[PDB]
Each structure stands twice: as C-alpha cells, then as structure tokens.
Amino acid sequence: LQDAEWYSREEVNEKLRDDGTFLTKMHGDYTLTLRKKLIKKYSDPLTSSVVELINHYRNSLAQYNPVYPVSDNIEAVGKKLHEYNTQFQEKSREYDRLYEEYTRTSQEIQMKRTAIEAFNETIKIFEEQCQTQERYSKEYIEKFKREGNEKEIQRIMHNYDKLKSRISEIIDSRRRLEEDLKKQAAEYREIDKRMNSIKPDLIQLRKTRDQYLMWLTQKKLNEWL
Amino acid sequence: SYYHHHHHHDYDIPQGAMGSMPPRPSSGELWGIHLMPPRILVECLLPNGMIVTLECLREATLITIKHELFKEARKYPLHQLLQDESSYIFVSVTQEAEREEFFDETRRLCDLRLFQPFLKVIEPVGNREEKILNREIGFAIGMPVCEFDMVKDPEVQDFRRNILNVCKEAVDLRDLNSPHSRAMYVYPPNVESSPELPKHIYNKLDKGQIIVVIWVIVSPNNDKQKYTLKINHDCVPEQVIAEAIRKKTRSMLLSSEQLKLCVLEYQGKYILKVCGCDEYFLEKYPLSQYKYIRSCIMLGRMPNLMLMAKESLYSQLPMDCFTMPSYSTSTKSLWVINSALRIKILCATYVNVNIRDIDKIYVRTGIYHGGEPLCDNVNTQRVPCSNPRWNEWLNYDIYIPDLPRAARLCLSICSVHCPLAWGNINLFDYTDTLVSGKMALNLWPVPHGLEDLLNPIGVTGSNPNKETPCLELEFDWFSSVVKFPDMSVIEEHANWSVSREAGFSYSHAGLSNRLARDNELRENDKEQLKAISTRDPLSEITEQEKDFLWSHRHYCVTIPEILPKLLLSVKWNSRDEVAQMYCLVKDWPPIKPEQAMELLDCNYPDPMVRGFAVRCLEKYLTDDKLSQYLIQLVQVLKYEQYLDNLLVRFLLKKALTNQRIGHFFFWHLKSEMHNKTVSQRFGLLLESYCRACGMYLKHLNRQVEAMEKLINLTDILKQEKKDETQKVQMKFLVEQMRRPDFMDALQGFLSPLNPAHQLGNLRLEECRIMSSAKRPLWLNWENPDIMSELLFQNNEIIFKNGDDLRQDMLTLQIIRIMENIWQNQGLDLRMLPYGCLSIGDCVGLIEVVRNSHTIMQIQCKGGLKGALQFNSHTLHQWLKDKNKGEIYDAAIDLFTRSCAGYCVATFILGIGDRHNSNIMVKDDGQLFHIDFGHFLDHKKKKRERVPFVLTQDFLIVISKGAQECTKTREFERFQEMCYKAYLAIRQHANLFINLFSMMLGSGMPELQSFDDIAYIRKTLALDKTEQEALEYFMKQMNDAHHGGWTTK
Ligand SMILES: N#Cc1cccc(N)c1
C-alpha cells in the first residue's frame, strides 16, 4: 500500500505533463490525479483499501459519474545526471539562439517586403513623373516653333534622360532587394527546419534526465545540476 | 595531461564574447541607414515634370527647402508652368510604404521618416487639410490610419464605427461643467483610495496637524512669498486656500469684519498647485488623502503648495474639440441542429521538416473553453514528412447544441510526439454565427516553455504572417447561417431545466449534480463550501467538490466569492447546466474587483461571466485602483474572443475620462504594438483613444518623437560605434544631441514615466552614456516649473535600448502592491518601487533615485587602502558618516524596516540572486533592490530559493555595530517584522496568484503557464496552515543564514 508503484499539486502536474495516465488532511485523504481530473473503507459506493479501489477501475469511470499507471551505482548514475543536464542545457541555447534568428529573420524579411512595396510606390511616382513631363515638354516643343529649339530641347531632353535613368537605378535597386528576400526566406526555412529536429530530441533528453533524477531520490544534486 | 590530449577539431576561433544587447533591429531616419548624413542630395519632382536635385542639410525644414526649391527651379526649364510656391504642398513615399502629404512644413528632412530621399510637389488634394491630420494619429500609433481603411474583415470595420459610441459618451462627460471638468480630465486629483489614515502616519501629526507652506506670486511675478499654516490633516483645499488668504491679507488697515469679506471675494478665485510639478487639488478630499501630502508626512517633509488663479489655469487648458471621422425574423438557431461536430482537415502546405530526422506528422485537434468539452482526437498519420495532405472529417463526441458560446477549436501539426505549428479558431464569430465553410488558418510556431501538443490558451485567430504553415480546412454547412440562441431563449430553457429537476425521482445515485436536501441543506456542507471559497485559484478542485458545488449552486449565492470555483464546476459541454449558470450570473451579487479580476483571466472565457466581471469593476473599481492594475487589464484583453466587448468599452471610457489613466493606457498598448498577437487589436483601440483624447494627442506625439530619437541614437551606438572608446562614443553622443532636430525633439515634453513632471532643456553636461554594454543613456532635464527648486531643479531618467523591461515592471508593481498591503494594515516597511516603463520591444525608461549607491560603491569608496580587503563595517561606517545624532537611530530604523520587507518580497517572488551590484542604499539609510531579473525562479528548470541572503554587512548595521549580531533585540525586532510581513502577504495570496495569472497574455518567458505561477504557492505555503507556514519560512530563512530564526 505504501510503495504501490503509482502512490503536492505542483510536482504531480509536472509528472502528468504531456490521456488515461494516473497516480491538507482535514479536507480529505488520498487524491487520484487522472489526466485526459482530481478524484477524492475508502463517495456512495464505499465497499476496503487504496490498492483495492485502483485495480478495479484500471479494468472506466463512466458508470461512477457521467476513459497507464506510469510511475545501481548512485554515484555514476549521478554523474549521468550532470552529463545529460550539460547536454540538455547545451541543447537549450541552440534552440534559444535559433528562436531569436527565426524572429529577427521574420522581421528582416517583413521589413524587406515593406521596402519593396515602398520601392514599387516610389517607382510609380517616378513613372508618373516621366509621363508628367511628356505631356508638357512635347506641348513646349511645338508651341515654340524655332525659338531656342535645341538650346531648350537639349536641356529638356537632358532632364528627361536623367529622370528615366534614375528610374533605371531604382528598379535595379528593387530587384537586388528581391534577390536577397528569397535568400533570407530560404535561411528562414532552414532555421525552422533545424528547430523541428532539435525539438523532439530536446524533450527526450529532458525526459531521461528526469527519470535519472527520479530513480536517485528513491541537496547533493545541485553541483551536478 | 590537462585535457587527456583530446582535440576539438570542430572548434574554430577566427554573441557570447561581449554578450550583451540582444533585441534589434529598427531602421531609422532613412531606409538602410540610422541617421541621415549632415548634407544630402534630394531629387525634387515638380508639377512641370522637371527633376531638380537640391543639396540640403539633414536638419532643414520643408519651408526652408521649398523656398530654395522654387528659387533653384527658375534656373530649370518650363518655369512659367509653376504657380506661386504657396500654392503647393510636399509629398513622398515613407518607410511604411505610404504616400504621406507634408502639411506641417516646419518639419525637418530627417524627422519625416522618408524611404528614398525625394520630394514630390503638388497642390493640396482633398481640401479638408484638417481631416488629413490622422498623420498625427498614425504617428502616435506607429502605423498609418489608411492601413485600417483597406482591411476587409467586417469585425474590424464594425469595431471602428461602433466604438465611437464610447468616444462620444466620454467627451460629453468632459464638457459637462467646463472649464472645471476639463481641468478635472487633464489634472485629475492624485489621491489615495481611503481618507482613513494608518496609525504610524497619524503619530507623525501631533493630534492630526501638519505644518504646510502656501506660496503666492506678486509683481512682476518674480517675487514669491511663503505663508506657513499649521492646519488639520483632514481639512480640504478650499479651507487651506482661505487660511492662506487670511494670512496674506490681515493688515493694520482692515478690521476683522473687513477681512472676512476680502476672504469671500478671493477664496474661490484660486486653486492649490504642487510646487515643482503639474499636480493639483481640484476636489474636496482630506488634504491627507492626496498623495503628495501623505508622502510629505512619511518623509518628514513640509508640503509646498502654490495658490494659482483659476484663470491662469483655464488659460492654459485648450478646447478638446472632438470630431466624428469619415467612417460615419431570420435564418436559424443552433439548438435545432441535430448533428454532432465534425471538422474537415485538408492540406497544410508550408511545413519545414527534416525527412531524415522525423518519421511522421499529423494534425492533433480539440474543442475548448480554456479547459476542453470532449475527448481530444488526432487524424491518421498520412502523407508524412513530405507534402502532407489529409482529407478526413474528424468526429468529435459532442452535440452541436451543447457547444458553449465561447467554444473554440484548437489545433496543431505534430511529429513522431512533438508540435511543429499551432492555431486556434473561434467556432462562433462576433455576430454569434456558427462557423461553416472553408477557412485558411496560417499557424504560429511553438514558444520556449510550451512542450505540450496543442496550446489552447494561445491567441484565437490566424497568424497574419503569410509564409507560415497555412493549414486550410472545411466546416460542416447546414443550409442556413446557424446562430447562437437569444438570452430570452436560454432563460426559458433554464426555467424549464430547473422545474424539470424538481420532479426527478427519489433515488438519484450520481446525486452529484442535484441536491435532494431541498430548501434544507446540512451545516457540515455549508462550512465545507466556505472552506472551498477560501482556497486560491490554483488549488485544483476535484470531481466530487465540483459536483458538490454544482448541486448546491443556489446556496452558493450566499457566498458570492465562491463564483470562480462554481463557474469552473459547470459542465460547459451541457447546455442544460450552462443555461442554468447564465441565470445565476444574471443577478449574482457583485464582488470585489481583486476577486472579479480572476474572471477576466484565460480560464473564464464566457461573455456572460466576463460581463459580470466588468459589471463589478464599473461599480467598485476606483480610478485609483484601475491605475494600479492597468497593466493586467490591458494584458487580459488578449483573452477576449472579439475586438468589440465590454472590457474594451470600460477601459476606453476611463481612459477618455481621466488623462492620467489615458496616458498609461496609451503607453501599455503602444508598448506591445511590435507583437503580432495584438498589433491589430491594440492598433484599433489606440486609434479610438487617439481620435477622442483631446489635445493630449499632441503631447503624446511629442513624447513619441523624443523616444524615436533616442531609439535611433542608441541603435547607432550599438552597431557602428561598438569597438570605440567611451570617449569616442560620448563625443558622438553630444555631437548629435546638439543638432537642432535633437534639440527640438528632446527638450520641451512630458516624462512618460510620469506626465506630471515636465522635461525642458537638456543639460548635456550631465547627459552621458553609462558603462553597461547595452549603452543606456543617462539623460538629465531642467524642471521648468515656476517653483522648480522646491521639488527638484533637475529631472533625470535612464533610457535603455537593449533589455526587456516588462519583467522588472511587473515585479516593481508587485512590490508597490505588497507595500500598500503592509502599510494599509498598519505596519511600516518602506519599499522603493522605482519607476519603470517599457515603451516598445526591449526599449524602456527607468526612474533615477538620486542619492543611492550600489553596496559595491560603498565598498569601493570605503577603500581600505592598498587592496588588502573590504571591511564588513564599511556599510555601517558609510551609513554613520551620513546619519549623525538622533538621526542615526532613525536611519537604522529605516534600513531595518526596508531590509525586512525587501527580504520577504524577494523570497516570495523568488527574483534573481541578490548581490553587491544589484542592492542599493540611500544616504538617509533606506535599502532597495534593482535589476531584478527572472521573477518566478526561471533558472530552476536547469529548490525554494532565498535570493536575499543577509551577509554580515547588513546584520552589523541592523544591530548598531554589536558583535555576534545573531543575538540582539535589534535583530529580534527585525525577525518579527519579517514574520508579520510574510503572513500579511499570505492572507492576500489570491490577489498575487491572480495578478500573475492575468499576465500570461504577455509573451514573458517566466510566465508561460500556471505551474510557473505555482512557485508562489510553495514559497507562501498555501497548502499548509499558517503556523506551519510560519515555521516553513523560518526554516527556509534559517538554512540560508546558518543560525538565527527559531523559538517564536
Ligand atoms: N485539473 C486541472 C487542470 C490542469 C491543467 C490546467 C488547468 N487550468 C487545470
């Protein structure tokens, strides 16, 4: 009854953590903490012991009220705790570094995307501007006839030359952003990818390290941890 | 021999080294560059189609630039096709990718936030120039308003138009008894909650009297005159104003009767200012009840007020001038629908997984209410790891009429057991309409602390970020828009559901859900209920207790405070039960705000519950108490299902009713605008506030502009000026601060830490970069008050670019609350919760406490010459050096009073380990901690720790130099303060649990889920009885100290 394999609220949550698994005096006696559910001779149907009551229901709780009994060196199984705890904490930094890079790259990217919206908007306003000058510049060639003909139209065409070639530089500046956008977006897929491979092996490393620490405790621990 | 000759081949030497400063990165005054060059070329696109490129100075105004553009455009062709310059406005593409017209031509070329350096010239289209000052709004919010106008979603649009209801109603309260009521909005009286005084404050009064000092001003306003009244603590501003006029105007030419009349024609022309800051005493409270006075009493200070004429005050107040913006029986009931729930998974697209590493991937799914209404299910592990596509109707064992109003699907893609992505949808929309059709949910990546599969406390909705796992799906369509019942209808169904139970017969085993005791219950029951009612939120309730509660629900009206436990004991999957709970809540006795706040956390998502919770706040929550808990109330908006809701309408109103609340309500929202979990919601909310808040928008825009100067400034110091000497950096800093754009922007404005204080004029000699690698700026301002000298001639606050303040900010708040608890229950421990304010992503502001030093400075200064050792008395000696006379005795009282409190607060919270450079002591002998770090013991994942371990240094000082301090009465006293304090918090432990619970919203790594908070149970020992808990604390304190702490 004392040992019983499966036999406060905080650590029991951390032992039920991650559907069917189970384990003050003045409020009541023992508590069955089934995960899917805290459940208080030992309600109405009372008929002898704590080991009695659990073996019956292992074979469902629907008919009671309207669904896994999970539970020799000492010094060298204690070094392993230091070993797996250095591995586990090594692994955390790697998962933490990459969650920053991911989020920075999420921003760096989305910053780029905006800047492309910006460029494109800029370009519209420059494309709208060479359009703007062709209206008035070509009204101001024919209206003149001969006066200043090339001493005007050269310097009108010079301006117009600079306009569209400045457009040329912007468009190339945008393209050069877009190329790097994909390179960033590639690296972004790579950050996620490796996060997803570290993650499963992070939890197992964590889980073994708990069970290694469980088995020992069946103050000294802190130097290893 | 050292390393057993083991090589590490991989290891190569060619953000750990100088490992500080990790947030980043935000672009500045132009694209790709933090701070535009001091001279720069700008291409000016004209109306005539000509490009002229001006070389302008960085700092040049648009008035200056236009004036020169039109000079220099004569020299180009087609001059005659330009109108007089005055006929034009500027425009360019900005870094938010919008085309902003530039109306305020005083603005400088750097301050415009251009993308490419170019201006286009045009005539002002959209002749309401007046209306296109939501640049003002967009600037405050930091995203342009037009960005909402092109959002499709009706909820958003609907929020935008409907929330104006609130804005119009609040503005109607403002201009009610104006100008007084306007002054009351702007300068709302800064007043403690209660008029009743603690005994230790009272005893400083000699039978309830304080010497006060009323200053007054005389021609040509230069000469000022004191008038030191000694008046009652509980007399009001008007009584004080009279006495100060009595004294000012007694004379040898006025009889008493002549005086009395001169008092009456003067007494109501004036009001009381605080000398040194913009605080006022605008309404009838006991002087004591104003915060300024009470601090003056505690600090042993003489209040210094000013008589100010109301017309010089209603001079300064503007018109707030609110405007309405340009944006101004049927088909089905859910209970008819006779099927179970089934939802179709279709195809997740953008999933990034190593085929080498992972075997197989599937979609786990569930329905929830915070906790879940059916056995959780998955789907079969199909097209694994490589273009995954399932085409499965999932079948959830629950009838469609038994879905509660706030029911939510939570789902996630996983690995075999390991979550890749996640996302949760509301099964009903904001119009009550059951979700049917095809949805395109983009997912969220799992956080740090969350290892579990599904994450249901996570934000309801899709990610806006496109390039994420976009798991689309299909919902069952029932030939009609299926809607949730009316309340009138849920009422009727309950009235029937109760009357029906009254005829269910004799034996019902599974008594559980029904009384059988009838109008007469047992008295052993009635005391086991109030026994439950005492228990904190995290003492999880059993099925027996739940059912026990649920049956006796009608006697649970006797004990309103039980409600959270009762609400958690409803079967939210049984509409029969749920419909009855709605009918109790309908008229359940209102409860205290500190208890009603639990009901706005993640575990109470029902609209009716959250309704009742806001209803309590509307009644009991004072403007005082709201300010205290505003951080949690903003954070809890996240857990609301829809944008428009009662809590948003409550806060928005208070915010537009009280400008001191408004201020922090802006900044707390504005803080989190970086975070895509809330950018939409808070963006919209902030638009409302900003459109309705009167002239305070203009004041916010000045604060904002000043912060973004400092953000750019520190941002350069941390990129391009790393690897320079302080000397070089500091030269760069002062060079920059002297440019007129910085001079404009950083001089005339309000301290966001407290908008009562004004900042004017930088003293750049006292401005400096601290040593820290984060490159925090120590900034110093002149207090431009008429009575600066009476409070502080200089105001100085630290701005930190690298570091996340909101841990600190919460612990600081949590302290402030323990302090008030302790003091308002008559026991004096003086905590110094300094000012902290996060204003963005790892950007913030910290109040400087003048005259305080890290213990390490005490020891570095107390320089035992020659580097032999530091002496443990040096603190004691340094403190003696300051406090000499009977003063010394009182300073040790202060040290001993602070040291106790800080020991208990520290212990309970489990803040970072305390040490020389993070403990601080003040000249008058008060001690206080800084740089708290990880609050609820965040390194334990790698114990019930004691972070403040009182070394000799402290113990020496607690007793007055005595040897073997362990055994003085000086120490006995100190211990009993610790025990009395420890227990004080233990009677209020619900509140602290609750405050921490409300903060899970924020993406704080130290608050990921409730077991993080569970630490604060152990440390308070709430499972135990107080005398065991006492002994537990003594125990915990004794082992850390190695002697002392027994035989109470
Ligand atoms: N019982 C239980 C339980 C488990 C996890 C979370 C919450 N809120 C409750």
Swiss-Prot record, chain A:
It comes from the Eukaryota. This is Phosphatidylinositol 3-kinase regulatory subunit alpha. Residues 6-70 form the SH2 domain. Binds to activated (phosphorylated) protein-Tyr kinases, through its SH2 domain, and acts as an adapter, mediating the association of the p110 catalytic unit to the plasma membrane. Necessary for the insulin-stimulated increase in glucose uptake and glycogen synthesis in insulin-sensitive tissues. Plays an important role in signaling in response to FGFR1, FGFR2, FGFR3, FGFR4, KITLG/SCF, KIT, PDGFRA and PDGFRB. Likewise, plays a role in ITGB2 signaling. It is linked to Agammaglobulinemia 7, autosomal recessive: A primary immunodeficiency characterized by profoundly low or absent serum antibodies and low or absent circulating B-cells due to an early block of B-cell development. Affected individuals develop severe infections in the first years of life. Belongs to the PI3K p85 subunit family. The SH3 domain mediates the binding to CBLB, and to HIV-1 Nef. It comes from Homo sapiens (Human). Polyubiquitinated in T-cells by CBLB; which does not promote proteasomal degradation but impairs association with CD28 and CD3Z upon T-cell activation. In adipose tissue, polyubiquitinated by the BCR(KBTBD2) E3 ubiquitin ligase complex; recognized by KBTBD2 through the SH2 domains, undergoes 'Lys-48'-linked polyubiquitination leading to its degradation. The modification Phosphotyrosine is found at Y99, Y212. Isoform 2 is expressed in skeletal muscle and brain, and at lower levels in kidney and cardiac muscle. Isoform 2 and isoform 4 are present in skeletal muscle (at protein level).
Curated annotation (Swiss-Prot), chain B:
Changing E543G: In KERSEB; also found in an endometrial carcinoma sample. Changing Q544K: In OC; uncertain significance. It is an enzyme of class 2 (transferase). Changing H1041R: In CLOVE, KERSEB, CRC, BC, OC, MADAC, CCM4 and HFMH; also found in an endometrial carcinoma sample; somatic mutation; shows an increase in lipid kinase activity; oncogenic in vivo; requires binding to p85 regulatory subunit to induce cellular transformation but not interaction with RAS; may mimic the conformatitonal change triggered by the interaction with RAS; enhances invadopodia-mediated extracellular matrix degradation and invasion in breast cancer cells; may alter the interaction of the PI3K/PI4K kinase domain with the cell membrane; increased AKT and RPS6 phosphorylation in HFMH patient's cell. Changing C418R: In CLOVE, CRC and CLAPO; uncertain significance; somatic mutation in CLAPO patients; shows an increase in lipid kinase activity; may increase the affinity for lipid membranes. Changing E543A: In CWS5 and HCC; also found in a glioblastoma multiforme sample. Residues 337-485 form the C2 PI3K-type domain. InterPro entries: ARM-type_fold (IPR016024), C2_domain_sf (IPR035892), Kinase-like_dom_sf (IPR011009), PI3/4_kinase_cat_dom (IPR000403), PI3/4_kinase_cat_sf (IPR036940), PI3/4_kinase_CS (IPR018936), PI3K-type_C2_dom (IPR002420), PI3K_ABD (IPR003113). Residues 207-309 form the PI3K-RBD domain. It holds the Pfam family PI3K_p85B. The keyword Lipid metabolism applies. Residues 515-692 form the PIK helical domain. The record marks K774 as: Implicated in the recognition of ATP as well as PIP2. Also crucial for autophosphorylation of the p85alpha subunit. The keyword Lipid metabolism applies. Residues 763-1045 form the PI3K/PI4K catalytic domain. The avian sarcoma virus 16 genome encodes an oncogene derived from PIK3CA. Heterodimer of a catalytic subunit PIK3CA and a p85 regulatory subunit (PIK3R1, PIK3R2 or PIK3R3). Interacts with IRS1 in nuclear extracts. Interacts with RUFY3. Interacts with RASD2. Interacts with APPL1. Interacts with HRAS and KRAS. Interaction with HRAS/KRAS is required for PI3K pathway signaling and cell proliferation stimulated by EGF and FGF2. Interacts with FAM83B; activates the PI3K/AKT signaling cascade. Belongs to the PI3/PI4-kinase family. This is Phosphatidylinositol 4,5-bisphosphate 3-kinase catalytic subunit alpha isoform. It comes from Homo sapiens. The gene is PIK3CA.
